[PDB]
Amino acid sequence: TGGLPRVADLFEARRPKEPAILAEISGIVSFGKETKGKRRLVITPVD
Amino acid sequence: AVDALLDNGRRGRAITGSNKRPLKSLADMIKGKQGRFRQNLLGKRVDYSGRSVITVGPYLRLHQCGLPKKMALELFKPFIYGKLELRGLATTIKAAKKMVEREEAVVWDILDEVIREHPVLLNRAPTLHRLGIQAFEPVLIEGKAIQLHPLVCAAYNADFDGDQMAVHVPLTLEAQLEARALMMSTNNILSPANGEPIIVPSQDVVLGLYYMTRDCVNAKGEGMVLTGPKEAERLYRSGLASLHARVKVRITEYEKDANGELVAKTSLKDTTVGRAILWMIVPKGLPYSIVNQALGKKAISKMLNTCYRILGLKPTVIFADQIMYTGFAYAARSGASVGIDDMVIPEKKHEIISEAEAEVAEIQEQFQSGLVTAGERYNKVIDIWAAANDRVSKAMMDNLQTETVINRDGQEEKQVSFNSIYMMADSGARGSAAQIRQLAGMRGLMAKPDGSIIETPITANFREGLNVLQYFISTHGARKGLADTALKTANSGYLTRRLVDVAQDLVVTEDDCGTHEGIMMTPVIEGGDVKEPLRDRVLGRVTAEDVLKPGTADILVPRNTLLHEQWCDLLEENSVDAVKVRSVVSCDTDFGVCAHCYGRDLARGHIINKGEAIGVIAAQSIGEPGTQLTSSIQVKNKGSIKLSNVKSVVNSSGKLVITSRNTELKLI
Amino acid sequence: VYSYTEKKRIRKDFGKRPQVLDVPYLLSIQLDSFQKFIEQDPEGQYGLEAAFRSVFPIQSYSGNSELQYVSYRLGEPVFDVQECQIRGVTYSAPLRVKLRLVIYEREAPEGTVKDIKEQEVYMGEIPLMTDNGTFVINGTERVIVSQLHRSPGVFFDSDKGKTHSSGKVLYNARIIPYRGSWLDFEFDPKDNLFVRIDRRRKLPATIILRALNYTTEQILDLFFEKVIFEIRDNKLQMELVPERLRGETASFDIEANGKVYVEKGRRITARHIRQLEKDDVKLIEVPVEYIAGKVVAKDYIDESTGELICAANMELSLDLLAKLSQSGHKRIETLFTNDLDHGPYISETLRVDPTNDRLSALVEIYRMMRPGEPPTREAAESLFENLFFSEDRYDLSAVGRMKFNRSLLREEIEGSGILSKDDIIDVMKKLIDIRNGKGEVDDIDHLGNRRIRSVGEMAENQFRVGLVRVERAVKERLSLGDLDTLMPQDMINAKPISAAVKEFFGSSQLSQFMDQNNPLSEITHKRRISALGPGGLTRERAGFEVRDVHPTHYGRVCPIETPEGPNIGLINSLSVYAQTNEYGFLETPYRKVTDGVVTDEIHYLSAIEEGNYVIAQANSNLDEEGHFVEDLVTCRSKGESSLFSRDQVDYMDVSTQQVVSVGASLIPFLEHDDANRALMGANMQRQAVPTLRADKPLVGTGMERAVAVDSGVTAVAKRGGVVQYVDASRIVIKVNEDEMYPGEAGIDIYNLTKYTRSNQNTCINQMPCVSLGEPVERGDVLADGPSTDLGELALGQNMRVAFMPWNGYNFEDSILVSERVVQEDRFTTIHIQELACVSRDTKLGPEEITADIPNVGEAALSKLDESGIVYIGAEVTGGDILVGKVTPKGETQLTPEEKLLRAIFGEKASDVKDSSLRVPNGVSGTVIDVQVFTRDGVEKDKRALEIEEMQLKQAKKDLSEELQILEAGLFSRIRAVLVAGGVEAEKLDKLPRDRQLEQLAEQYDELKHEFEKKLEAKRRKITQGDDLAPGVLKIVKVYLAVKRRIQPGDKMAGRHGNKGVISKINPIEDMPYDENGTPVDIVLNPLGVPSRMNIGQILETHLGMAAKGIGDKINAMLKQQQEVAKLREFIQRAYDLGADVRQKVDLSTFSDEEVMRLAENLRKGMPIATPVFDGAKEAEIKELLKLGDLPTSGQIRLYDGRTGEQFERPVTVGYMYMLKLNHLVDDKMHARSTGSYSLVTQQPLGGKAQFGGQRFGEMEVWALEAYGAAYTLQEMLTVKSDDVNGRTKMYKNIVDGNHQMEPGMPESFNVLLKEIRSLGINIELED
């Protein structure tokens, strides 16, 4: 929201609806296994 | 049987012979709700207390309040009993009862003896934050309501409607010392959320000093010379010249050119009589330049802040009181009245409404043909009426800004219009040109029951007529306001509840530990303008590392240094933008915090000491604001375009296209 | 135009707007509803008679005792309003019902054995509504505050985007029953026609159809269109019905007659249907696509080829097509639904309801009732048919059935009560319309879902309960009634009704204690619109939308009347001109405008009919009759307030004020005031102080007398005539013969309440306004209620208010007032309080009042007479004793050295103690009246008997008046009989009053005989009327009297929403005065306005300068002792001031004598009737300051009473009408630190009553944790008032003055250690 509501959830640190995921490790990322419900986001490190 | 002692354990609620009664529960009897029935709202009606409404009291000095005789009796008896059998003006304590049984004038003098320098604690009921608790000195008042020092009520947010303050007697010398240690009136000057001297002249006192220091073109005596602001005092109290005449008076402004020795600098100033009188109140050290303005509310609060910076604590305190007494004094000299015949309405207002009429008529007709759609027509309408209000603004605002011209040393040299409205609108006290302009100009489009906007404005202003139509537009507004605050209140309390919940055990209990870490402090340069500076974040903190200057290999702020005003002015002499400060989340102190990781910004400006349980003071300070909670970008900042880490390239037409997502545009 | 009223004081009729609606009695809106309820109307009138009719003929199974209904009769009002207010007995009348109790022959074609009619049966009483919409039952007036719930009819709901939770805008329905249970409906973009029954879970719609035993081809026979597919000579065609083509797209090249009417790729919107119904082409060629995707109805199998592939209800598939379209069927009748318009709801709802017969249907509806248990089948058919079809259960009536069927646009908007099959299905058809094409949804704010429970309607609710509550013991009593046994008052008692009526009209959330302080405050309490109530829109369910404002409430819902805070949209009350519409709506007054001419026909409508009619606004420019100036006029079309040709308006609003309530009307220039300070204004007039000298607002709106006449605070006259004997508690009237009853002449009487108490324990006194020898009119006043002047609503008093900053006595809320106020004692109140006393037998021993009084001497008895009771006007203070109360002691406590001495020195030596009712701690007042109640059966001793004799004298004096006037009148007839029998006129002059004889000689005696039964019936009510209560035989309620004046610290305000508290009432010696010398009386703060925006009070300030200015003209002209013509020069100026508003001139009336009174009445200003929105103008205002010797500006340069200089730039000065609030400092200042604490808990005794210490809260605790106050917090929640012994260990400590204690234990803390001690852990602090 931008007031009490969102700040309250800030205190419970609620994982959102569509959580923006961050790249786990430095390195190349690729695909694998098309939509079966999920999809492989194979982030293979180079280092 | 053991279970019968707890409650009945988890058996079946053991009753007694022919009587439904789960037998006496020790568990619930020492504890209960909200912990126990002491540490809960159930903490009984305290002794040494007096619960009643409050009243003003101008003549009430800085370090004091006024207390009713009757409450005084009920709240000082034991002292009088011990004092009557101590001196020998009563034989026994029961004989003492009899003297006060008739209220003997004798015991009132003994009452005096136990009131003269007896610290008192004042705590209101609607108090959710610590700024509702202070300490004072008694003054015998023949009345029913507890009088209070005016320039403190703003912090209390305690008005005149039904605010009942409870008085709590600091009986032990410790509590009495705590009064005159941290809870004293002169001990709660800044807000424990930010270092500003929290009490800013609200409205009455502001206007007083506003009608004092002010300039114009026409004024009796404008031009003569005086060798002192003292005779300047005896010049206007008599009234042989006007309060805004530019008169040469020799004011002796001072300056702490030394480290405590304020070198004297006698200067001559062609100044207005009002601000000249303002100086007799101004403590030496402060520069005359700060009181050579047309008075501003932001300036008037930071004036005491700079009087706290330059002159320190003491000079600021005593000065604040002097202001209050003359605040009322010249407030009366103004006789700042406003009635129907004193207001002014532009007949250019109904002229802009004529314009505002034309356009909307034509747009609805475009819809009758079928050009603009309903929504298209919607916003179109809204925009022209908003711009119309700005024209109504550039109407009533310039009108009431400088339209008064007076014959003086030429044709008719204009001076800023002395309109009361103008004074409130420039003092900052209560004059909000937006409210005022919904009052004298077209109020505008009010929201709708949906949460959107009724495209119909409140054309007819408040001074002039209003219809039932305009009312119902604004009806959602009334509703809206009430609802939100009425509930934000409750949630803000549970907000502070969760805050105490989280930090109870944290105490600053060390000074230096062993960490050379903290986090990077950076100004929130985002969007257009640079909002929060590097300075105002670090203002009142402790430098983490040895920081270099934009100039290389030249350290300006050594590692452990307390950054205050001058050092912050030092930070802004060069162009250092990023500095690290030792953070408390990086604080190596085990189960506690060290001062070299916390800082100094508190309810004072000095070093945080060991003994300051900070967890809960954070709760209150942060939970307080609960009630106040709710295409093609052309660059407007004039600077150099610096492409940071972005890989752009020139192709046909010379367009510097972008091929990377990390396009961070900066304005070096 | 005038009455004797205007002769005493004419209010200057200032109005400019042509008015038409004669404001009715403002509580007739309650009276009339009550009138349609209880009234002799056996015709079938919707009320008591239709109510009883509904329940009658009352009988059960095989009892053979059908009870019929005849009529009823109501007794006499037991007491008068006055006695009901003084003693506190219910004001009602015995319901004497005439029940036709007819017993029938057992097992015969109903032959009568006894056709008895049992009359006047006592079925309890019914509170008669006093003609001011009031109800005095116990003590003072409690009133039935109207409520509001869901209007009985039918509902359609939205809940779009939030209750859909996907973006699929929902639009469903409901059916709000009148008397039974709900019937909800569904319709989501999920494609669902469901029905949530009664309240519980959602069931398929078809679950009802099959309970009625519905065959599939009876259900689909009514719902949709059947598409006739025809295969002629093995070619596929369809009989084109373009009417069905709504919601169908052009997939194949739509060919008809060979012509391509529809190219492939552009839906058949509303164009190609025109092109096909121009020649009605119902023969088209279709390939294969168009048919493969449908569902068939009849049973057509493969008749030429030979296979079982299709029977009933099947669609087409890719494999089997092979034999389907080559088989060749002649008439293929399918079903029809389309994915755009007609949603296949019911066609899929049968596919959700796994039933197909009555049995199964019954079962699943029972599961909606009680889930988990299996039903039977016979108790299942009983359940079903009796939930919505039993007339002894489900009812809707003409209210529910009108809004039901008119919302269905039918004509059967009156008739049945039970459900009709095709009507439930038509609402279902309308719901299909709602989720596909037509139909809209009813929002809660529109009257559509709002029913106004009225006073009489709420009575029918409580009384219907009474009917059935006792009936469960009446019905079976009819079965258990053989022949000569059951009779009225053998089945029906009084309690079964008493325990219900007294429970809802005595103390209920919709029938509460009327806040009594201001007559206006009283009307705004009696006449009120609550959104809360028994089954109303509460604050735990209704959120913010139910609270908001809706346009349709113009002229009915004043959003201004409501407390300030959370509850702000469920308290909003009615608009004055409005009246209750029969179905639960509101008759909205209008004016019939025959297009271009304003007729004076005022029409009452609703908000629903408002949507069909276009209405002009009252506040518009009309001319001469109603020939609208501009070509355009404000026309509220169908919700939109646009501009139209004036020749189209069907109606027009009554008056410009026709939108708000009383508290807003009486305050002018709201056309300049802010809505926020408008609500604040509303709030404070309802809290209008009961002042001593009640002055009426000079500049009102003309509803002053209107308050007096529409309220019941002033004793009005029901006949005109010369007053004969006016004292104070009595006003004896002689009535003029033109309206003097030919029934025992006609001498009326009006008894005035003299210095009594109220709910607020504030004083009420009807002050005699009529002197001796002054005639009245049928409709004038005799007394003055609290805060009234000559009947006229006089709340507070107006003073010379100013707006100048002046030494901090005006900081935003701080107010500064002249000491002259309390120096004249103009603003003072009287608080007469009642304190109950108990005596006469406590099981421990029969109690006696005072009798044996120890623990005192004779000093206390100086005011405790020969009864031990307090004097007839004492000055009791501090801790004295009001009345003596004795109570016995105890067995276990008597010592052996006093058991022996006990059985010697009398029967009661040391047993009876002194536990009297004492003067409340902390009060110093005066006992005025003693309300005593002798033991029911046995009298008191002497004092209570002295009070009876006291009452006796006060009553005797009055009844003798009405006696001697008729007794001596007919004596004059006897003075005419002796003349006829030989003149003895002068002989009777010399003879005593004892000297056609039969005739009047005997009538003299009867009037005296009447006089006897008069006072004895009166003393009947004096002697045995002291019934107290079972247990407490003798009750003594004392009446103290305490004047509380105006002092520094009291919260005072005004009308325009300007609050504040007097900071320091200063001596009149500091008051800034003008050139004249007359100081100012009020000094307020200016700074608020530019953000407060209540400028009307700065206009009222300048107009106030004028309203009083003219008064000072006549004031000084009367000092010159000038003639009637000089004052009339001024009257004419002040009548034709400076504009053309219709002043309604007189001068044919006595503009000499009739105005000579007005002279010394108008010398202190002039009462004006000014219209708020459409009344006074600035041109007229400045004209009156010019018409007075006042400054055109209204701003004089004053000279400080503490200086004497000119407050530079003339200051705002003039009069404004002040208004003190009921917030008093004696109800705020309660000091408690030391005293006594409770016994049940360590919590102190009291609160905001006796002993008011600070009930320290948990969050202030947290403030002390934000500070370093730890040691003080220690003693705070422990040693101070929490440790039962630690407090004394501190009291005996500071009587030495030593502030030094040790770390003591919270002792219960010591018991907490023993708690863990009896478990497993334990305390043994080591080292």
Curated annotation (Swiss-Prot), chain B:
Top-rank lineage group of the source organism: Bacteria
Intrachain S-S bonds: none
Residues noted as binding Mg(2+) in the record, renumbered to the chain: 159, 161, 163
Residues carrying N6-acetyllysine: 655
Chain sites annotated for binding Zn(2+) 2: 513, 587, 594, 597
Family per record: Belongs to the RNA polymerase beta' chain family.
Subunit and partners: The RNAP catalytic core consists of 2 alpha, 1 beta, 1 beta' and 1 omega subunit. When a sigma factor is associated with the core the holoenzyme is formed, which can initiate transcription.
Function: DNA-dependent RNA polymerase catalyzes the transcription of DNA into RNA using the four ribonucleoside triphosphates as substrates.
Protein name from the UniProt record: DNA-directed RNA polymerase subunit beta'
Residues of the full protein shown: 302 to 985 of 1407
UniProtKB/Swiss-Prot annotation, chain C:
Function field: DNA-dependent RNA polymerase catalyzes the transcription of DNA into RNA using the four ribonucleoside triphosphates as substrates.
NCBIfam families in the record: PRK00405.1, rpoB
Lineage of source species: Bacteria, Pseudomonadati, Pseudomonadota, Gammaproteobacteria, Enterobacterales
A cellular-component GO term for this protein: DNA-directed RNA polymerase complex
PROSITE patterns linked to this entry: RNA_POL_BETA
One function term, GO molecular function aspect: ribonucleoside binding
Keywords per UniProt: Acetylation, DNA-directed RNA polymerase, Nucleotidyltransferase, Transcription, Transferase
Stretch forming the signal peptide: none
Sequence positions bearing N6-acetyllysine: 1008, 1186
Subunit structure comment from the entry: The RNAP catalytic core consists of 2 alpha, 1 beta, 1 beta' and 1 omega subunit. When a sigma factor is associated with the core the holoenzyme is formed, which can initiate transcription.
Name of the protein this chain belongs to: DNA-directed RNA polymerase subunit beta
Bilayer-spanning residue ranges: none
EC number(s) from the headed UniProt entry: 2.7.7.6
SUPFAM superfamilies (UniProt xref): beta and beta-prime subunits of DNA dependent RNA-polymerase
Catalysis: reaction(s): RNA(n) + a ribonucleoside 5'-triphosphate = RNA(n+1) + diphosphate
Pfam family for this entry, one: RNA_pol_Rpb2_45
CDD domains named in the record: RNA_pol_B_RPB2 (cd00653)
Family: Belongs to the RNA polymerase beta chain family.
GO biological process, one term: DNA-templated transcription
